[PDB]
């Protein structure tokens, strides 16, 4: 063991290094305390001909452009064209980059969002990618908007509102800005839940290509399909879509990353109306007389918002009816009251 006696000096040098890094590692808190302003970063690869080529283009908030190479600590998610980065008074170095900005269905919604995050072990053991796009289509009456948003609130994760008129803006070019923004919060921030609705109305493919806004909504929408079919790593936040009609369905939605789990929900018959309406009345005071037969039959061509309005109208006259519990005939009274 005479040859292994030199290891003690190596360990003394290592512990001496750990004892001497406290100063230069301690000044990080007083030098890199807080960036007082915010500056935008745009990536631009340079070439010097070590003497290696590496630089970046900076843009301050005060509309002043300066020069600085790619510097800082070990970068993993950095080097992207983002904002809200670290900057000192005048050195203008990069130190800290930060991103700027219920009963009848519980299986398909909860699984499709948990398995691409928790079941990675079975993904590595089987080599199978999970489905991404789910299409809650079918005739109206199910209430996919209020029930799908309510179940998205029951997912206990982050929820981001995104509708039709949200992406469609008065100016041009903003659609891709809100797509890269929904991918900023969703893709860049924590995994959130985004539910859009009425995709069939904007998925119109006309023959006369002279006047159709829905084809610019197919430029932003098919640009999202470019950012899903073109971008293989779709393991992050998915795109959940739903339509109220099967009149004009986009044929280019046939992909695992795209809308694959197209679950057909038919007209809300006594069973389905008893399901979504048992959800709508699973907590309120329901008297032991609501057979749901006549009132579930009279709910024809009534969406979940209009059926919720029927529940409100049932919640209107029961005050003056004298009974503190909602009765059977008050549902059909609300139906015949709205229409």
């Amino acid at each position: 063991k005479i040859m292994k006696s030199e290891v003690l000096r190596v360990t003394h040098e290592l512990q001496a290094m750990k004892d001497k890094i406290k100063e230069n590692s301690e000044k990080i808190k007083v030098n890199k305390t807080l960036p007082y302003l915010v500056s935008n970063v745009i990536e631009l690869l340079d070439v010097d001909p070590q003497r290696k080529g590496k630089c970046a283009v900076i843009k301050t908030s005060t509309r002043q452009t300066y020069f600085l190479p790619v510097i800082g600590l070990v970068d993993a998610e950095k080097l992207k064209p983002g904002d809200l980065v670290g900057v000192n008074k005048d050195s203008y170095l990069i130190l800290e980059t930060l991103p700027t900005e219920l009963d009848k269905q519980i299986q398909e919604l909860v699984e499709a969002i948990v398995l691409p995050m928790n079941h990675k072990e079975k993904f590595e053991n089987l080599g199978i990618q999970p489905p991404k796009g789910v299409l809650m289509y079918g005739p109206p009456g199910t209430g996919k908007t209020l029930l799908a948003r309510a179940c998205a609130a029951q997912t206990k994760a982050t929820f981001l509102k995104l509708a039709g008129p949200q992406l469609v803006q008065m100016f041009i070019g903003d659609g891709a800005k809100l797509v890269r923004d929904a991918f900023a919060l969703a893709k860049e921030k924590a995994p959130s839940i985004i539910f859009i609705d009425e995709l069939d109305a904007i998925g119109t493919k006309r023959f006369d290509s002279e006047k159709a806004g829905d084809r610019e909504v197919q430029r932003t929408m098919l640009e999202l399909l470019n950012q899903l079919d073109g971008f293989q790593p779709n393991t992050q936040v998915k795109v959940i879509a739903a339509t109220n009609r099967v009149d004009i369905l986009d044929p280019a939605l046939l992909r695992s990353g795209r809308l694959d789990r197209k679950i057909e929900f038919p007209m809300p018959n006594e069973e389905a109306r008893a399901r979504i309406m048992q959800i709508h009345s699973r907590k309120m005071n329901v008297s032991p007389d609501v057979n749901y037969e006549e009132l579930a039959r009279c709910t024809d061509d009534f969406n979940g918002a209009q059926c919720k309005a029927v529940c409100v109208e049932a919640g209107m006259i029961a005050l003056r009816r004298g009974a503190t519990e909602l009765t059977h005939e008050d549902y059909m009274e609300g139906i015949l009251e709205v229409q």
Binding site: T65, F67, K205, A252
Partner: protein, 313 residues
């Protein structure tokens, strides 16, 4: 007694030499921290642009902020990058120059029977593409007066400035009265920017469609799309090859017949057959088992493949 002390001392020396790897690996990163701390010392640089040069040694610069200045020549750099027309960088002290700042042919694959040739472009792009530049057919809406000429010259101009350029056109049947005037405009611009002194060795494009009656007889003319290949038989040998070299990481039942799965899933592509087998894996992962009975496999082939055949409009 004596023979065991060599093995024992070999064990103490072993556990003594197995503890250096837990530190010597992170000491390189710790030293890299001070290396970066010494690398963040070059600060205070600004940018500029050169328009007019009077003296070969001293020229005029144009800052982004708006005020203009004049700088000299540094002893390290040469007159190669000193020529005008190249964006350079400056320093706050003495306005010295550290370095500069750089600014920033056809094939038709259509099949008269069936659809899914866009998924064939997904098969080729998923096989060997190495150049990401996608153009969607829904960007030529032309709801304005009609000026897509500068859109074509600017798009192919960005294809000249950007070396990676392999396009995959699709869904051209719906965009193919004056409905044909814009097609002759954009197509004659394609000839005007493909038959002249254009970099045909770098640009590449693949046009796809869905119907054999809307084949755009203007596009059927040679020139634009010279290499034309029909899809009547979806390359059963190449389909079987894609299934073989793409059926590696996916584990299935022991008794598996490739010819039956190939024959029962035809018409579209072999990569779509790969989507049928990975769909059968997407159901085998729902059945929390590695290998299952081929009944569910035949449910993914028949139900999923026939669902592609029915919903492939």
């Amino acid at each position: 007694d004596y023979r065991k002390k060599l093995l024992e001392h070999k064990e103490i020396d072993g556990r003594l030499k197995e503890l250096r790897e837990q530190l010597k690996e992170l000491t390189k990163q710790y030293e890299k921290s001070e290396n970066d701390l010494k690398a963040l010392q070059s600060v205070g640089q600004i940018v500029g642009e050169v328009l007019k040069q009077l003296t070969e040694e001293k020229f005029i610069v144009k800052a982004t902020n708006g005020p203009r200045y004049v700088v000299g020549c540094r002893r390290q750099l040469d007159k190669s990058k000193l020529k005008p027309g190249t964006r350079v960088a400056l320093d706050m002290t003495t306005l010295t120059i550290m370095r500069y700042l750089p600014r920033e042919k056809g094939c038709l694959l259509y099949g008269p029977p069936g659809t899914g040739k866009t998924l064939l472009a997904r098969a080729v792009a998923s096989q060997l593409d190495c150049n990401f530049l996608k153009v969607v057919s829904s960007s030529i809406v032309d709801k304005y007066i009609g000026e897509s000429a500068r859109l074509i010259r600017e798009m192919f101009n960005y294809a000249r400035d950007h070396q990676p350029c392999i396009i995959f056109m699709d869904e051209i049947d719906a965009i193919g009265t004056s409905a044909d005037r814009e097609i002759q405009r954009t197509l004659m611009e394609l000839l005007n920017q493909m038959d002249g002194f254009d970099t045909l060795h770098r640009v590449k494009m693949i046009m796809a469609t869905n119907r054999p009656d809307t084949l755009d007889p203007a596009l059927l003319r040679p020139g634009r799309l010279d290499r034309k290949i029909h899809i009547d038989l979806p390359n059963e040998q190449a389909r079987l090859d894609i299934l073989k070299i793409h059926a590696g990481p996916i584990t299935k039942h022991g008794e598996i017949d490739y010819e039956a799965i190939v024959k029962l899933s035809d018409g579209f592509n072999g990569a779509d057959l790969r989507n049928v087998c990975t769909e059968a894996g997407m159901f085998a992962i729902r059945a929390d088992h590695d290998f299952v009975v081929q009944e569910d496999f035949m449910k993914a082939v028949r139900k999923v493949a026939d669902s592609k055949k029915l919903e492939s409009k």
